[model samples]
Every structure is written in C-alpha cells, then in structure tokens.
Target: MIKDPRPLNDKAFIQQCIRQLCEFLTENGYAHNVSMKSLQAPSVKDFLKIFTFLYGFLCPSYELPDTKFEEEVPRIFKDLGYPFALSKSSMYTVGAPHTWPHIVAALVWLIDCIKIHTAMKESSGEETEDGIMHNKLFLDYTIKCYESFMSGADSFDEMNAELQSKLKDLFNVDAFKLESLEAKNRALNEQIARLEQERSTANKANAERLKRLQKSADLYKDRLGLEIRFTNINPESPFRKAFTAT
Candidate 1:
C-alpha cells in the first residue's frame, strides 16, 4: 500500500523482517539472559544499557548467532533478485548494538528493504534523478543496506567479522548452491573445451575417412576399362558369337 515509504526502506519487507525477528532473536540466544536464573530477554533499554545486554546475551554464548542468519540474510535479498553482497561500511559501534541478534535482524531487514527499494527504483519507470531521494531516516537504512551488501567480502576487521560471515552465507544463492562459483564455472569451461576438442577430432576423422573413400574411388576409376567387340567372330559367324570381356 505504502510505496517506498522511506524512499529506500522496503516498508513491506522491513515490516515482515521485524515481524519475524522475534523468532530469529530467540534462536540466536537473545531470548534469555544468562546472568540470571529466570528468563530475561534483551530489551530496548538494553541497547543503551549496553553491557547489561552484552553480558547477558553474549556471555559464554560460545558464538554470537551461529552461522544461520548470515546465510538467511543474503537469501532475503536474493529472493527479491537484488544483486550485490552485504555492505561492509557499517561502522559498528563496538558494543551489544552490533551483536544483538534482534538488532542485526532489523539492520539486515532494513538492508534488504533498501535493496528491494533500490532494485524497484532502478527497474521502475521513474527517472533516476528524482527517484533516488534520501532523508534523515535513511542514514541507518542506507548504512544498513550499504553494509549489508558490503558484508559479502573477505574482511578481517573485528567489527565486521560477524556480518561478513553472514554475507558470505547470504551471498551464496545460486540455484545449485555450490560452495564456490568460480570452481563450478571453471568446471563448466573445462567441459566446454573438452566438447570442442572432441568435436574437432571427430571432424578430422570424418575428413580422413572421406579422403580415403575418394582416393579408393579414383583408383578404381583410373585403372581398368571393359569393352565388347564383335570383330573376332566375323569369319566364323555361324559357329561363334561375339565375345564380351572374354
């Protein structure tokens, strides 16, 4: 209903990503605080509270959001046919803000929402000049989209390590889902070369066979002749018959 509400944010998908974020949070361990006995999920205040959520969320968690979200995110963009890896530009504030599963969920959601928005604008009849408007709210979404796509690269910076990982996973969206695109492409190229070589050999063999056949025919035609004559029977016409190749 609301078309490009933020002019870049995918209002619909952002809405859905937020809606689905609860599940992503729980699975990623933001569901309960480890410092307490009872259940204490990370809250909005925890963002400003920072370490409160950090210790409770990531403390001894062994891994911050193991490997799932990284893969799911790129798929989210890919489903919309959005091309480009996750963005690498998010200057992640060194704190729980970047590490929260729920927060990452929203950031990526916005990222994809932007991607969908960017793609739609690029494809839309709208001219690029006016269609590419940005605003105050777009900072986060813009940065999020920027970083979301950038994350698909090989980054060693501690701040971006987690996101790049997800980017790697999300970036892997081919129909075959191969581990490496280059590897598969190389194999395909090799197969093509092999087929070309085989075709060439067959052509040469066929030419040789044709050459032999033509030479054989020429040899047969050149060597011998056949004739029927009746001159031998002239005198003895009554007793003898004309001879044919006798």
Candidate 2:
C-alpha cells in the first residue's frame, strides 16, 4: 500500500524485499523489450521490485509523462543517443516485446522512489545512538545466513539466536547521507591524486630548470672561457691585440 514508509521494518517485508532483489539480479530484465503501456498499469509486486533495486543507480533521470507514456516514453529513449530520431517509437509498444525500455523505465521509477524516500538505505544497515551498531536486523540476519552457509555451520537456530541480540536501535537510514559521505570521500581521494600529480609536475619542472642552468654553466666553461681568461690577461697579450688607454 506504500503506507508503511519503512518496508524493512517487518521481518516478512524484509524477506520479500530480499527475494525481489534476488529475482531482479538473477533475471535478464533487459533481455527483451516491453510495452510502454504495461508499466503504468497495476503491477504492485513488480513495481515494488523495480522501485528500489540497485540498477536504478545506472539509469538517467526519467521525466517522461506518465499520462502520455505511449508517446513521451519513446522520446526519452530517442533522446538516449538513439541511432535515429524515430527509432524509440518502434521499441515501445502496446504489446510486451520491448524489454530494454521496460526495464529502463522500471529502473527510472525505482531511482525516483529511492530519491523520494532516502530512508531505504536503512535496509542495508544504519547505526544509531546507545551503541546500537547493527540496527539493520534483516540485513544482519541475511548476512548471518550467508556466512553460516558458506562456513558449513549446522547451527542455524542457535546462531540465529545470537543474531537477534540487537534490532531495536535501528533508524531508517538516509541514502543521501550515505552518498554524501561517499561523495566527500571521493572528492578527498581525487584531491589527493591531483596534489600528487602537481607534485610530480613541479619536480619535472625543477629538473628541467636545473638542466637549463647547467647548460648555461657549460657554455661559460666552453669557448666562452676566453672571456674570463683573456679579460684577466692584462689586455696586452699578443694572443689577440694590444690596446692602450692613453
């Protein structure tokens, strides 16, 4: 019903979300084309499925008109670096043969929902006050199951008992907060790289400058050595000529 803002709050809903995630990841949603009409139609389960999947991150912003989905949706794809201007109109249709656009549209919607509700990040695991580290109960449980499965452990119920030891401290996580941190870290790393590059360039410039200076010194020691040597030769040497300032 979308009323429950926090879908991961319930154990069953968490499981459902995990199942939906696995299904989308495992399936080839882009393997075929999809009709432009079916997406706006009633498909509660899948709308949820597509609403918050990981692939949404890759899709560009979709501002196509839902009321005119038939016409406008294709234009979005047509604007997608299409081969021809009218090509997208051929891909979207009344029947479900257009796999790529369907998935693209779904991903577009999914990202929209996430942006609208940034709290979905809590489904991954959000920490809180009072030393509540693992507020993401479902996420933690899922990981426990996975690690136990990988470790070949027979203690399912017993381990799970150890698993539920902390769940109350969770707050719905903000996706923007997480991404903000990521973006900050990304900027920092890039800055460091730029600084390193600047340092290298400075070093090269200094070396080149040193080379030029050394070349000048070599010229001073070369044929031009006569300048210094003859100047001190009293200007009376027969080597060149004798001049008197009478």
Candidate 3:
C-alpha cells in the first residue's frame, strides 16, 4: 500500500512519512491519535505505540512494556540491523525536529522491511500449501483405488476415469490420454494372457493325442507279430503255406 510520486525534500518527506505511519498503524489495528504535528514532536508513549506494532510484527513472541520502552528502543533497532546505535537520551528528547526525522526515517525503513518479510512469507506459504494439498489428493486417490481393486473391481477403466475426474484440479488433461493408454495396455495384457492359456491347453491336448496314437500303434504292432508267429506255426495258414510253396 505504498503511494507513488512520494515527496523527496525533507520538509515534505516528514509529512509523507507521518501520514504513511498513521495509515500503517490504522491498517494494522493500531489506530492512534497521531498526526504529522504530533509525530513531529512525539512523546515516549507515542513512540511506544509505534514501536509496539513494529517490534511485534518482527518478533511476535515477545510482549512490549512501557517501563523499559526507552532503553529497549535502541536495543531492538540494533537487533534489527538499523546501522546506528540509537541514543536512549535522544529517544527522550525525540520531540526536537532533527531527532524526530531520524526516528521517522528508521520507522519507515522498518515498515518496508515488514512488508517485504510478509510478502516473502505469504508466497512461500502458498507454495507449501499447494504442494502439500496436491500430494494429499494423490495419496487419497491411490488408497481408494487400491481398496477398490482389493475388493474385486475387475476393470481398471473405472479407476482410471475416477482418477481423471478427481485429479482435475491438480493435473492437466493429459490424464485423459494417460488413462486411455493404461486401459489399452491392460486390455492387450489380458488378450496376451488368454492367448497363452489357449496355447497351453492346445499343447496339452496335442500331447495327449500323441500319447494315445503311439499306444494304439504299439498294440497293432504286437498284434501283427503275434499273428505272424501263429501263422508260421500253423501249416494250413496262407502266409505259412505261401512261404513253404515258394
């Protein structure tokens, strides 16, 4: 909420800084009875109000106290890398115009720092939430699919469609093409499995047929040999009589 075309000269700059400070206080729920004139000659209590909000934003875990407010101001500024050790005596006599401007400039810098810190944190928070939410969705959908398959949903197309529908927020329409490919691959796998089973059955049947054919041929060979032996022993048999006549 920084304004554009901000004044540059020290006389106007103090006015602008106080106005921005007032707005900043109001925006952050610290609406004070403050003005350019009042801040140009600020009291210890007034500075307390300003630094209370400032220090709280940077270090939210600590509480502010009016008793040690004067001494703590310089220490806090030093902790925040203000580049100058603020004199506690100067804080007491901060109503003087020269001292007031320095304090105002520091306050504005702290405000800018707070804005930058907040912006950075807010963006990183959004990124973390996005990734965590996306992964949670994926895990939930995976569990549901796993349970459904375990309970005997024979077809995977339903799961694929469910995935496409549910993950529409996190994933692109490539899900559509991906699901199609997965379904097609599964269908091809089933066809290959069926063909393998059929081939095995056909091989088993062929083996049985071969075994029976071989058994029948062995029986016929034994029977023909026995008949030939019987005919040779029987002189009246044609096979034996033809051989003897020859």
TM-score of each: 0.25, 0.25, 0.45
- In model 3, pairs of residues that clash are none
lDDT of 3 by residue, 81-110 (tens): 777557878788675756777677778878
The 10-residue segment with the lowest total lDDT in model 3:
225-234
| Poorly placed runs, candidate 3 (over 4 Å) | 1-9, 125-246
Output the TM-score of candidate 1. Answer: 0.25
C-alpha lDDT of candidate 3 relative to the true structure: 0.73
Q: Specify the highest-lDDT model's number.
A: 3
What overall lDDT goes with each candidate model? Answer: 0.45, 0.49, 0.73
Compare candidates 1 and 3 on TM-score and give the better one.
Answer: 3
List model 2 lDDT by residue over 7-81, tens digit each.
333545434444443344445353333333333342423433343234334354433334644455345435543
Cα lDDT of model 1 by residue, 167-209, tens digit: 5575766445664776878998989999999999999999999
> Candidate 3: deviation at residue 86, Å?
0.9
Question: Pick by TM-score: which candidate is best?
Answer: 3
